[PDB]
C-alpha cells in the first residue's frame, strides 16, 4: 500500500505538468525503491548501499571512502555490473552483450 502511494504520488508529479509516462517506467523505479524491504531512498545514503559490487557503488558519491571499506571488509565483485565492465574496458552484459556467439562446426560444413 506504500508502493501504492509512492507511485500514486510520483505520478502526480509528472502528470502535474500534463505529461505522460508509461506506467512501467515509473512503476519500475517505485518498485526498485520498495522491493528491498521498505523505502530505500534514491540517494548516496540509501540505494547506493545495497550489496552491489564495490567497484559499482564506488562511481557515485562515496567513491574513495567506499573502496576503502572494500579492502577492509575484503569484498568481492561480480563484475555483473554495467559500470564494472565500463571501468574494466570490457563488453558489458547489456543487450548486445547478453549472450555469447559461437561457430558450430556442424552447420559450418553442411553449408557448402
Amino acid at each position: 500500500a506504500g508502493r501504492a502511494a509512492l507511485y500514486k504520488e510520483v505520478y502526480n508529479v509528472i502528470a502535474s505538468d500534463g505529461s505522460y509516462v508509461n506506467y512501467r517506467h515509473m512503476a519500475l523505479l517505485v518498485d526498485v525503491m520498495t522491493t528491498q524491504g521498505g523505502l530505500t531512498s534514491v540517494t548516496r545514503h540509501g540505494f547506493n548501499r545495497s550489496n552491489t559490487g564495490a567497484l559499482m557503488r564506488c562511481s557515485f558519491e562515496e567513491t574513495v571512502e567506499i573502496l576503502f571499506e572494500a579492502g577492509a571488509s575484503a569484498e568481492l565483485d561480480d563484475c555483473r555490473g554495467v559500470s564494472e565492465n565500463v571501468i574494466l574496458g570490457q563488453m558489458a552484459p547489456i543487450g548486445t552483450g547478453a549472450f555469447d556467439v559461437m561457430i558450430d562446426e556442424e552447420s559450418l560444413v553442411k553449408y557448402m
Partner: peptide, 14 residues
C-alpha cells in the same frame, strides 16, 4: 573434442 568455440569480441576470432 573441440566443442563449440566462441567468437571473441572486437575481432572475429573464435
Amino acid at each position: 573434442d573441440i566443442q563449440r568455440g566462441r567468437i571473441l569480441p572486437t575481432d572475429g576470432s573464435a
